[PDB]
């Protein structure tokens, strides 16, 4: 529950940072 | 194996006790032929300490001659007789066959390491002097002290009487039952 | 045979039939202990109930326990009556076997106890006289599969690491490992969905002059994640090539191949009308959700369990389609619109109405069209709904099996914990005996002998 | 040739399907040798399909389905009766309420 | 790739597949290619099942 919720937020953060890496990659090639 | 054929003749038990032994035997192995797999848990549950399947495995093939893969009641009761109420000389012959693992009756110092470590495997972890890896080989060397320094069944059979520990240890269950 | 030993005198009379045609010494009877049947009823007892029966009946069948000589151990001379420690009601059927020659099986008694009693008296299981066999074998198979599910023997360097990765719930680790993959497959498939909407990625608002082609970057990232996950799985396989052929593994490998094949095609010779097939396979990433929800696995087990009658569904559907189309086309080949141009053009009608779907793109016009169209609709209802329950009931049964397996796994673990607790209690009892109703004393004595033979002591 | 019964075998239904499959070709040949009736050749084409039922022997489930229908003859009869019931009643209501 | 090709986008094919998964049928948009009818019928059957 709450203990699982903490690691759920922790993994939400790593998913977000992976998506932000993807956004950095797409911004690397604009037009 | 007729219950009257295998009386004190060839099986030194009274028929009154032999009936009870058979009743308790078939009550756990109904098919009448015990396999080594059953031979493990019927024994290990005697000791609430560490497991004993290792010793029981070495007991089974000694019980089961000619490698039948399972023991019938006749051989079981024969061995139980020669142990519990058998001859002191004949008591130790089987045990020499037990200690021997290389089939032929020869000693090359390796058949005792496994047996003694299996025997020491019973206590597990709650022993007063905590077991160390050197303790089983030390006890094996203690046993090597009493075996033939010269390069055996004959010396063991002649020195078992020399060590009175064997003599009055074999008699604990010879008189009783 | 020995089963009709009560009818020797019959054959004795039959012997007199072939006396005048005989030529020999007539080797005379082999004599007997008694030429009578005064053998009295022998009171054989089972746990306090006396089941009197005649000796000759018992030695009618020798090889069983009650036959031959192995009953002597159970003999009780000091009161002159056999004693057995077994179950009375069970033993009644074994008694009936000697009387008739074929056992039975009670409708309502535990198969484990019955089978162990049956084997105890040394008589073969399949003696059943095919009157209760249909039920005994049914219950025996049910028990066998119950104990097979009792034998799931699930376990816990990298040999345990990859299993823990496969473990659905390791709290902090496996939950992250699954959630990342679930989110990433979800965003991949939703990207494939949205890469088609006009404003998203297509010439929807650029004709005047956003069409942001970044879905290629997202697809590349996602498929990189898939391929690294599958490389981890390939290093995690106990058998590398042997476990490749698995269903989930083949789904994974076909969930990654299209991207690589597309890249190889891009720098290869361009073939017109081929990239559409490649883009179609972009949707198969959604199949990876099998590990997410177990319902997909249950459905796969259903479709590959009742895979027999699905072939019948397909075959009978083809029969009905052909039969009704070949009459539809000839029924109104000539009409005003004459939409039913040909049989393959009538397959669509006979399948849009066999399924009770109903569009109106093509409908019958002639009167002979109407009757057979309505007949087709009813036949479609029948054929379609015929193999439904064999699938949905099978699926529900499999789901119940998979729930029961978890329940019994939890119960088995609790039982094992109780076994460990009882063992610890035995050790505690021995220690209490050492510090300070005969079997416990003798057991403690034997353990005391162990203490001396191995010069080690026992402490809590 | 290997007929345990010369006439009872024909009394069965599988032989009926066989002969229904066989006949249209021969009757069409005889007609085209003697007649050119309009509307009969198309009937021949229509009947030129019942080998689908000739597939019955190969398909194990087809005999099962046939016996299933034969067993529940009364239920299918009541189906047909109730369908005619509803069709008559509701078609009459529609015509008198929408003409 | 059809002439009228009312299947302008996957968010539009959602409606067609949801009215053929439910065995509903409207006929506002139906497939017109041999590659379309096959999966339309298969979708109807899968809709019955699901």
From Swiss-Prot, chain A:
It is found in: Cell membrane. Homodimer (in vitro). Interacts with KCND2. Identified in a complex with KCND2 and KCNIP2. Forms an octameric complex composed of four DPP6 subunits bound to the KCND2 tetramer. Interacts with KCND3; this interaction modulates the channel gating kinetics namely channel activation and inactivation kinetics and rate of recovery from inactivation. Genetic variation in DPP6 may influence susceptibility to amyotrophic lateral sclerosis (ALS). ALS is a severely disabling and lethal disorder caused by progressive degeneration of motor neurons in the brain, spinal cord and brainstem. N-glycosylated. It is linked to Familial paroxysmal ventricular fibrillation 2: A cardiac arrhythmia marked by fibrillary contractions of the ventricular muscle due to rapid repetitive excitation of myocardial fibers without coordinated contraction of the ventricle and by absence of atrial activity. Intellectual developmental disorder, autosomal dominant 33: A disorder characterized by significantly below average general intellectual functioning associated with impairments in adaptive behavior and manifested during the developmental period. MRD33 patients manifest microcephaly in addition to intellectual disability. The chain crosses the membrane at residues 7-27. This is A-type potassium channel modulatory protein DPP6. The gene is DPP6. Promotes cell surface expression of the potassium channel KCND2. Modulates the activity and gating characteristics of the potassium channel KCND2. Has no dipeptidyl aminopeptidase activity. Expressed predominantly in brain. It comes from Homo sapiens. Belongs to the peptidase S9B family.
UniProtKB/Swiss-Prot annotation, chain B:
Isoform 1 and isoform 2 are expressed in brain and kidney. Isoform 1 is also expressed in liver, pancreas, skeletal muscle, small intestine and testis. Isoform 2 is also expressed in lung, pancreas, leukocytes, prostate and thymus. Regulatory subunit of Kv4/D (Shal)-type voltage-gated rapidly inactivating A-type potassium channels. Regulates channel density, inactivation kinetics and rate of recovery from inactivation in a calcium-dependent and isoform-specific manner. In vitro, modulates KCND1/Kv4.1 and KCND2/Kv4.2 currents. Increases the presence of KCND2 at the cell surface. It is found in: Cell membrane; Cytoplasm; Cell projection, Dendrite. It is a peripheral membrane protein. Its main location: membrane. Ca(2+) 2 binds at residues 148, 150, 155. Residues 164-177 are annotated as: Interaction with KCND2. GO terms for cellular component: cytoplasm; cytoplasmic side of plasma membrane; dendrite; Kv4.3-KChIP1 channel complex; plasma membrane; synapse; voltage-gated potassium channel complex. Keywords: Calcium, Cell membrane, Cell projection, Cytoplasm, Ion channel, Ion transport, Membrane, Metal-binding, Potassium, Potassium channel, Potassium transport, Repeat, Transport, Voltage-gated channel. Belongs to the recoverin family. GO terms for molecular function: calcium ion binding; potassium channel activity; potassium channel regulator activity; transmembrane transporter binding. The keyword Ubl conjugation does not apply. Residues 1-48, 51-86, 87-122, 135-166 form the EF-hand domain. Ca(2+) 1 binds at residues 100, 102, 104, 106, 111. This is A-type potassium channel modulatory protein KCNIP1. The chain holds residues 47 to 227 of 227 of the full protein. GO terms for biological process: chemical synaptic transmission; membrane repolarization; muscle contraction; potassium ion export across plasma membrane; regulation of heart contraction; regulation of potassium ion transmembrane transport; regulation of signal transduction.
Curated annotation (Swiss-Prot), chain E:
The chain crosses the membrane at residues 34-50. It comes from the Eukaryota. Residues 11-22, 23-30 dip into the membrane without crossing it. Residues 1-10, 31-33 are extracellular. Signal peptide: none annotated. A motif (Selectivity filter) lies at residues 23-28. K(+) binds at residues 23-26. Detected in ovary, in corpus luteum and in granulosa and theca cells in the follicle (at protein level). Highly expressed throughout the brain. Detected in amygdala, caudate nucleus, cerebellum, hippocampus, substantia nigra and thalamus. Expression is not detectable or very low in heart, kidney, liver, lung, pancreas and skeletal muscle. Not detectable in human heart atrium. Phosphorylated by MAPK in response to signaling via the metabotropic glutamate receptor GRM5. It is found in: Cell membrane; Cell projection, Dendrite; Synapse; Perikaryon. It is linked to KNCD2 mutations have been found in a family with autism and epilepsy and may play a role in disease pathogenesis. Autism is a complex multifactorial, pervasive developmental disorder characterized by impairments in reciprocal social interaction and communication, restricted and stereotyped patterns of interests and activities, and the presence of developmental abnormalities by 3 years of age. The transient neuronal A-type potassium current called I(SA) is triggered at membrane potentials that are below the threshold for action potentials. It inactivates rapidly and recovers rapidly from inactivation. It regulates the firing of action potentials and plays a role in synaptic integration and plasticity. Potassium channels containing KCND2 account for about 80% of the neuronal A-type potassium current. In contrast, the potassium channel responsible for the cardiac I(to) current differs between species; it is mediated by KCND2 in rodents. Is specifically and reversibly inhibited by the scorpion toxin Ts8 (AC P69940). This is A-type voltage-gated potassium channel KCND2. It comes from Homo sapiens.
